[PDB]
Every structure is written in structure tokens, then in C-alpha cells.
């Protein structure tokens, strides 16, 4: 079958801290002698816009209580960085991993370590949509939950949870403080943008179906990448790029991308009553990387 899986979370679990400001408490990311967390921890709002420049000016350092487990970290200073705060603390995180900052692109998958009260509670895999939103599972207290990817021994931090749109999907910022999709860290009316199926991920999915004996839906026809792309942009699907990354999957199925593109066009928003690996529509969830990794264990 095809599972959304998470990468092991241990390396990140020891970077999570509880950040309390007054009454408000959420999660922070604790690397070196700095704690990153969503800036709205110092604001108290329900229905109106927040003046963050003012909230920062009134901010009092002694109203912070930051803890890793039952170990409290003295707050030294705090500065604002986009939708985040840089909080300088008393000591270094000895368990600071080898890490980098990386901003996710649409279509790319990463891991979410769902945290509550400064403790990791659950871990699951997600995929960044063309929306620059994700379909996470978050409730009250989840803010500051980190998103990450582990790449050759290196932890790539890419997400800190900020926000749930009315549609139920979720938005975070990267570790530079930049809100994905230019959404705003306010409780204002913000409609989830239009999104397209990331076609490359759909291609990976259909390859996975061929590999698992699902071949009823295959078309005999073909379209060139260049002509599919001009159809895709007007039919709520993204354009297809280099296609080199589909060589391993093509070799394993003897099926080229062009023929899969043809299957997609006949399928898109017009499935029968049939399913494909238990899916009733084309899924955006899995990358070629994930599919190749899960079926053959190579990267």
C-alpha cells in the first residue's frame, strides 16, 4: 500500500520548549541559545487585527517563562523576526542538531511534530500544496509546532505552525518568520486561495498504482509535456518539469510520463465509481521521492 509516513522525530524532540507569556502558552523551537516561536504569543486578540509593533514595544521580558521539560531557561532578550520572535535565553541547547533553514516549495513533503505545552505529542507526514497551505491536524495549543525534513544527516527546519484558515487547512511561517502564501498572522477573514493538483506528485501516485498492479486506467494515447502543461494551467493542475526523476519509476513499469499525462487528462475531475489504491480522485500527497523510497528503499 501507500502510506503517509513521518521521518523519525528524536532529533527534533529535544528542541521543543514551552513558551509562556503572561497567560498565553505555546511551543518554541530551541536551537543554540535562541528560542523561535510565533509572535502572537505576546498579543491577546480574538476578532481584531493585532498591532504587533505596539505589542512588541510594551513587551516585558519578566513576563516570559520558558521551559524545556521542568528546566527553566532565563530570558535575556527578544526581537521580532517576521511572524516570529527571536528569544535569547540563558543557556545553549546541548542537544542542538546539525540543522539548516529551508523554505518549502509547493508539492514538497515534510514532517510535522505536533506539540502541545512544550512537549511533542504526535508526528505525521504532510505535503505543501500550491496554496502554500497544508492539511495538518492541529487544535488549540499547537502553535509553534515545527515542520522539518531530514536530509543526509541534516535537519531542515521549514515550518512553525501559526494558523488555521476557515476551510480547515493550516498555515505556518518558515524559520525566517515569513508566512507561507503571504497569509497574515491575524484572526481576520482570510479565504484559502485557489490551489492546483501538483501534477508531478500525481504522476508519482499513478506510478505507484502501476507498480501495485493497478493498470485499468492507463490510456494508450500520449501528450508531450509541453502541451500538457498548457492544458494543466487552465484545468487546476501544475506544470510538469524535468521528468528525469521519473526514470526509476518508468524503468520499473515500462510506462513513460507522456502516457500517464494522457491518463490524467481523461481522469481529472471525472473518475468513474472505480478507485485507485483506495482513492476516488487523483491525490497530491506523495512525491516521487516518497514513492521510490517506500517501494524500493533507494533515494
Amino acid at each position: 500500500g501507500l502510506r503517509k509516513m513521518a521521518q523519525p522525530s528524536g532529533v527534533v524532540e529535544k528542541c521543543i520548549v514551552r513558551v509562556c507569556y503572561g497567560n498565553m502558552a505555546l511551543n518554541g523551537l530551541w536551537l543554540g541559545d535562541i528560542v523561535m516561536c510565533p509572535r502572537h504569543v505576546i498579543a491577546s486578540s480574538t476578532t481584531s487585527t493585532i498591532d504587533y509593533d505596539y505589542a512588541l514595544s510594551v513587551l516585558r521580558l519578566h513576563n516570559f517563562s520558558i521551559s524545556s521539560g521542568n528546566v527553566f531557561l532565563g530570558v535575556v532578550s527578544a526581537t521580532m523576526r517576521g511572524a516570529l520572535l527571536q528569544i535569547k535565553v540563558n543557556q545553549n541547547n546541548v542537544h542542538t542538531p546539525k540543522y539548516t533553514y529551508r523554505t518549502v516549495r509547493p508539492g514538497e513533503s515534510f514532517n510535522i511534530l505536533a506539540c502541545y505545552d512544550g512537549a511533542a505529542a504526535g508526528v505525521y507526514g504532510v505535503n505543501m500544496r500550491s496554496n502554500y497551505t497544508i492539511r495538518g491536524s492541529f487544535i488549540n495549543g499547537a502553535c509553534g509546532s515545527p515542520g522539518y525534513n531530514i536530509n543526509n544527516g541534516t535537519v531542515e527546519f521549514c515550518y512553525l505552525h501559526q494558523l488555521e484558515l476557515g476551510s480547515g487547512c493550516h498555515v505556518g511561517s518558515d524559520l525566517d518568520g515569513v508566512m507561507y502564501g503571504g497569509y497574515e498572522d491575524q484572526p481576520t477573514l482570510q479565504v484559502e486561495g485557489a490551489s492546483s493538483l501538483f501534477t508531478e506528485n500525481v504522476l508519482a501516485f499513478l506510478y505507484a498504482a502501476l507498480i501495485n498492479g493497478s493498470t485499468w486506467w492507463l490510456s494508450s494515447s500520449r501528450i508531450a509535456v509541453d502541451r500538457f502543461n498548457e492544458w494543466a494551467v487552465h484545468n487546476g493542475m501544475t506544470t510538469v518539469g524535468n521528468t528525469d526523476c521519473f526514470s526509476i519509476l518508468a524503468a520499473k513499469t515500462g510506462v513513460d510520463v507522456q502516457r500517464l499525462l494522457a491518463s490524467i487528462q481523461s481522469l481529472h475531475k471525472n473518475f468513474g465509481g472505480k478507485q485507485i489504491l483506495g482513492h476516488t480522485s487523483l491525490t497530491d500527497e506523495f512525491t516521487t521521492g516518497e514513492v521510490v523510497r517506500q517501494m524500493y528503499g533507494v533515494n
Binding site: 502572537h40 492541529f138 502553535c143 488555521e164 476557515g166 497574515e184 498572522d185 484572526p187
Partner: peptide, 5 residues
């Protein structure tokens, strides 16, 4: 509306 978590 958007909901700050």
C-alpha cells in the same frame, strides 16, 4: 475567519 492556533 482565520484562527491563530
Amino acid at each position: 475567519x482565520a484562527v491563530l492556533x
